[PDB]
Amino acid sequence: WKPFETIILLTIFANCVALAVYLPMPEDDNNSLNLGLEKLEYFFLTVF
Amino acid sequence: RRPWYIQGAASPKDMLILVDVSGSVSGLTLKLIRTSVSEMLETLSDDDFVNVASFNSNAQDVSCFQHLVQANVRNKKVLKDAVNNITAKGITDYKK
């Protein structure tokens, strides 16, 4: 019952922003940034 | 593009075309790349040497050749037929 409202609201908001900066590449290419936003998914799938 | 012009306008060459066939080129730009490599091979003579390589997270030769070949009509036919058989898939790696 602490101010965990903000700590989870902002975490979901940053998850959305990290979902929107992903850039979908065809035929299974990739770039450096996409490979980083996956090393950021274990940080958003741990908190949740 | 007339061979007398290309002949008197520069010295011979040792050209190596390096097509990028990573996944992100699929679609329009891939077919433009095929037509472009063919129209570039058409600006070579029998004094120049050529080879078409190709990379997507691993670089290999587009055809059976494996080194620089003499860019005459038969070899260029081989290299055009090999460039037309090209498909796009994988991750890009320019260093390789």
Residues with Cβ within 8 Å of B61's Cβ and at least 6 positions away in sequence, in order, are: B51, B52, B53, B54
**Token couple for B8:** 């008197």
CB contact under 8 A, A26 and B27: yes
B20 labeled binding residue: yes
Count of beta carbons in the 10 Å neighbourhood of residue B25: 22
B46 labeled binding residue: no
Task: Please check whether residue B8 touches A, CB under 8 A.
Answer: no
Q: What is the resolution of this structure in A?
A: 3.2
Provide the b/e sequence for A14-35 (b: ≥16 CB within 10 Å).
ebeebeeeeeebebebbeeeee
What determination technique applies here?
A: cryo-EM
What are the start-end ranges of the H helices in chain B?
Answer: 3-8, 28-41, 73-83
Residues with Cβ within 8 Å of B88's Cβ and at least 6 positions away in sequence, in order, are: A27, B21, B22, B23, B24, B25, B26, B27, B30, B56
CA atoms within 13 A on the CB side of B92: 14
Task: Please check whether residue B20 touches A, CB under 8 A.
Answer: no
- Contact residues on chain A for B22, CB-CB shorter than 8 A: 29
